[PDB]
Amino acid sequence: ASLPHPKIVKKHTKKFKRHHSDRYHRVAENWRKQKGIDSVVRRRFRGNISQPKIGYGSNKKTKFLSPSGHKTFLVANVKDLETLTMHTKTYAAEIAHNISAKNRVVILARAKALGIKVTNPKGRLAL
Amino acid sequence: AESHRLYVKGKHLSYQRSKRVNNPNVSLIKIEGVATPQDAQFYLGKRIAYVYRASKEVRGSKIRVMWGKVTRTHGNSGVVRATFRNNLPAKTFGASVRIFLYPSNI
Amino acid sequence: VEPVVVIDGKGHLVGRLASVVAKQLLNGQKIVVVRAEELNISGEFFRNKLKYHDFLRKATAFNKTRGPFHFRAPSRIFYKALRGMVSHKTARGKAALERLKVFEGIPPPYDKKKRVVVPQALRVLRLKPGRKYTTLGKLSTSVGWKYEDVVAKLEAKRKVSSAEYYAKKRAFTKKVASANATAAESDVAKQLAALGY
Amino acid sequence: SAQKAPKWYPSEDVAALKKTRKAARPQKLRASLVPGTVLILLAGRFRGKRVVYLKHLEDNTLLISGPFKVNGVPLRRVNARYVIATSTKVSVEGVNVEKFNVEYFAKEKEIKAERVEDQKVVDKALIAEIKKTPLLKQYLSASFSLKNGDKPHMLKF
RNA sequence: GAAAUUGUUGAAAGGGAAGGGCAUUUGAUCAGACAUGG
RNA sequence: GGAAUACUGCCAGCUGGGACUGAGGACUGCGACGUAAGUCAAGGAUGCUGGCAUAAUGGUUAUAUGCCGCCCGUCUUGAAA
RNA sequence: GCCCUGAAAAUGGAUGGCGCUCAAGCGUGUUACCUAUACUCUACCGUCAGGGUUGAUAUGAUGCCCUGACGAGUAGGCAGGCGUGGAGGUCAGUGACGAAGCCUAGACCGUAAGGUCGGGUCGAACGGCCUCUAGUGCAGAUCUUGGUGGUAGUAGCAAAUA
RNA sequence: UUGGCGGAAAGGCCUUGGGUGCUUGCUGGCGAAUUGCAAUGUCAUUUUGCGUGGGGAUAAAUCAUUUGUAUACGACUUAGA
């Protein structure tokens, strides 16, 4: 249901967790680069956490693609849903978190009608 | 025929490694009866399997297989380099392994 | 290429035997070394008794009970040598040694199991003639091994039984090689001979 | 809106391939594979079985027989790389064998009466030729396996 | 009605710390698939 | 006296086994083999076959195993101190 | 030359360890083999440089496209981005048929700062894009305020007759 | 099943006699496919619970109390049908 695209290669699937985020509660996993003078991580000694650098960048040809092969698009309603009308093999729709349950059946309706793939159906869904 | 074996005995010795760094992507096998790199050239390309047991049955068996192939010789004494579809567990350093006769170019 | 390998300890050089054995384990081979009392070290008695004593004075200063342990028996003297050649503190090391047994004399099951030798560790293949060496048992008994005489007394009793055993065997292989004489030159005999057998 | 609309959008025209330049040339089997040669199957359903090479089918495969009333293998396809080719060998002059191709094996359970008939046709001539050399028939029915202190890399076959 | 810290339940590991990195075994969990004549 | 062989070197001489890669996506270029129409290994892989369904496969996670990894921040020629 | 004497220090100990004696030691030679983030070929990320192309010719001209080379980094400089309170403009944006917030070894996107979704909880508001603005991002300061631990059911609860 | 032998951890070994399955020492008669050209096809022995049918056996230790050969508290040594 989507364009060709080469096999998605991910290059570094793991997280990059800030050094010692695993040591003290007070320190969030959120990446932050060490500045310290003797720091093993900054100085890149064998045996430590790898730091995010540009060599890890994804293939432009596969960048931003999900498994399905589409880039996802945040959809708030039908007007928004409808921008992806010609680009049905290229993009997928994602229904915003704050979209009410009843409205979700309407966007969901119109997508099927247009053949746009939805990423988060089974959303605010009874049963 | 108490014997049914169509494979050569083998032992998983190590990963590829320097003194203090290993490479789990490559594995070193001792093939039973091979003693020289000139012998070990016979098995280049042959298929290896490491066969283990489990608790969960999958396709009706509690026996599982890790398949790989002999890729080149190692050192001077018949030891050989091998890569498997996944990477041998390292717990198995000393475990047995199977070198088959196919692809034959006999 | 074998389940378990029993090694007749005699005539071997400790460290050379240790190195070949300690490698077998890390490869999966189940080893069991016997007669560790008649094991050899190059260099005559006095040097090794001096070396052993040089090892014997090391201990935790505040609590000798926790510093280096000095096992005196030949089987454990060799086991010292081996373990020094295995990365034992790690799990892999633990498991390797858990494939090994070392015995002074040849105690039961192996009493009827063929022992083998390791040439590259065999003194008489490795030592230059004229060079002095050592008998581990005589060493161990000089550093507190209370049982050289017991194993001696038993080994004699064991070799006597073995003597009559091999005599029996030697008598039967006779019959086999004296009841072959007929079949020695049949047709199938010449038939076999053609293909090497 | 939840997300500002993109300003480009690709094209959903899926392109055609460049004129690829690969051209199937025939596969020349190795020298030890002459028709009639006793083969050892090293894999699959009839692994270990000793078997007679008959024909190089057009899809690279080796027509096999065994033959059936000797060891159980029927007329059968078999790939060359899972086979040891021995030195021992039977003749195959008096075996017709032309009717057998890819389509003979074409997946169009049951067991066709044509297949069972062709078997006895082809086999009859083989068991005929096989039986002249003593113990060849016996050999073919025994299964192959490595013994303690076999070294494939030196054994001759 | 967050966190520190705590009780209970459940899974797991633990021969003088714990935590981390590359790799895989095992266990758990989660996926992308979608369309072909009745 | 007539050779052979070693050593060294060249061949736009022939060939067996093993390994990793297959980026690119109409045509366009330089060629090769053909008397020929044509064909080709010539500006980047194709062909044939089979396998996977409460499954193959992959992601994460816990544990185990192999190797490896001292506490950050700081002043300092020099910090695990 | 090698070996021996000359050669005495305080916890128990160090050719790294085991151990090694025609060595696994000393001198010399010849092959083979092991292995770096280096070298060679290739994919991808980025940076720089050179070049092609809006001639009518749908959606990116600060764009598409071709080619070559390059990538260490404290103090430090510049650049391109991520997130926050409030402002003008715009999606006639989401919302009591559930906003914001919170929880979640569930999922997806980004090299990353971060973004998005599911489920649970919740109950009145809130967001995307173009711009404006600053009391705009914390691990440290014997930092400020508040809250909570190990220590620990521990020290202890014994002067003054009962 | 008849005799022995084995205490270094003997826990195994020799031996008598028949019974029974097989016997490729040799000569016959059948079967095998379609598991589709490899992938997945010998089941090993540990433990632990339950299900049966046969044989078998019918206790102690601890708390409490007590002694003082003992004792900081546990512990130790006594005694109680």
* Contact in structure between A68 and A92 (CB atoms under 8 Å): yes
Shortest CA gap D25–chain A (Å): 29
Protein contacts on strand F: list nucleotides below 7 Å from a Cβ: 16-20, 23-28, 39-42, 44-50, 53, 55-56, 58-61, 64-70, 72-76, 79-80
User: Which helix (H) or strand (E) covers residue C167, if one does?
Assistant: helix C148-178
- Block residue for tokens 């089987």: C75
Q: Which of C1, C24, C27, C100 is the best mutation test for B, with the most CBs of B within 10 A?
A: C27
- For residue B33, what is the nearest residue in chain D, using CA coordinates? D151
- Measure B99 CA to nearest chain C CA, in Å: 15
Beta-bridge partners for B28: B14, B81
**How would DSSP label each residue in D54-69?**
EEE-TTS-EEE---HH
Using CA coordinates, name the residue in chain D closest to A76. D2
Distance CA D50, CA D67 (A): 9
Write out the E strands in chain C: 4-8, 30-34, 40-42, 100-102, 133-135
Q: Which of D2, D5, D10 sits opposite A90 (nearest CB)?
A: D10
Q: How far apart are CA A14 and CA C151, in angstroms?
A: 62
CA of D17 to C1' of G107 (A): 36
Chain B with chain D: Cβ pairs closer than 8 A: 59
Between the alpha carbon of residue A102 and those of residues A124, B80, B85, the distances in Å are: 8, 65, 49
Q: SS3 for C156? A: helix
Provide the pairing of β-strand C30-34 with C4-8.
Answer: parallel
Q: Which residues of A touch D14 (CB under 8 A)?
A: 3-4
The pairing of beta strand B80-84 with beta strand C100-102: unpaired
Cβ neighbors of C78 (< 8 A, separation 6 or more) are C9, C14, C17, C18, C33, C36, C39, C102, C136
CA-based nearest distance D29→chain B, Å: 10
Instruction: Return the structure tokens found at D15.
Output: 């392109």
* b/e map D95-130, b = 16+ CB within 10 Å: bebeebeeeeeeeeeeeeeeeeebbeebbebbbebb
DSSP state of A77: S
Q: How many beta carbons lie within 10 A of that of residue C159, not counting itself?
A: 10
Nucleotides of H under 7 A from a protein CB: 6-13, 24, 31-44
Return left, alpha or beta for D37; rule: phi > 0 is left, psi -120 to 50 is alpha, else beta.
beta
Contact B96 C1 (CB under 8 A): no
- Tokens found for residue B22: 């290993």
How far apart CA C106 and CA C6 sit, in angstroms, is 10
Residues belonging to chain A: 127
**Cβ-based burial of B2 (10 A; exposed 0-12, middle 13-18, buried ≥19):** exposed
**Could you say which residues from 14 to 73 on chain C have a Cβ atom under 8 Å away from some Cβ of chain B?**
25-28
The tally of CA atoms less than 13 A away on the side-chain side of residue B22 is 11
> Between chains, do D12 and A90 touch, taking CB under 8 Å as contact?
yes
3-state secondary structure of A115: coil
B95 contact residues in C (CB cutoff 8 A)? 28
CA distance A96 to D10: 24
Residues 12-71 of chain B sitting with CB below 7 angstroms of strand E: 22, 24-25, 52, 54-56, 64, 66
Which helix (H) or strand (E) segment holds residue C83: the answer is helix C74-83
Tokens, residue D130:
């096989």
Contacts of C54 (CB under 8 A, 6+ apart): none
Residue D56, Cα to own-chain centre: how many angstroms? 8
- For this PDB entry, the determination method is X-ray
Residue with tokens 């190692």: B74
3-class secondary-structure state, position A112: helix
With an 8 Å Cβ cutoff, is B49 touching chain C? no
Q: B38 CA, F22 C1': separation in Å?
A: 31
Give B59→chain C minimum CA distance, Å. 30
Helix (H, G, I), strand (E, B) or coil at C80: helix
What is the spatial distance between Cα B35 and Cα B29, in angstroms, rounded to a whole number? 12
Protein-nucleic contacts, chain A 97-126 to strand E, CB < 7 Å:
117
Q: Is D16 exposed, middle or buried (0-12, 13-18, 19+ CB in 10 A)?
A: exposed
Query: What is the C-alpha to C-alpha distance for residues C51 and C39, in angstroms, rounded to an integer?
Result: 17
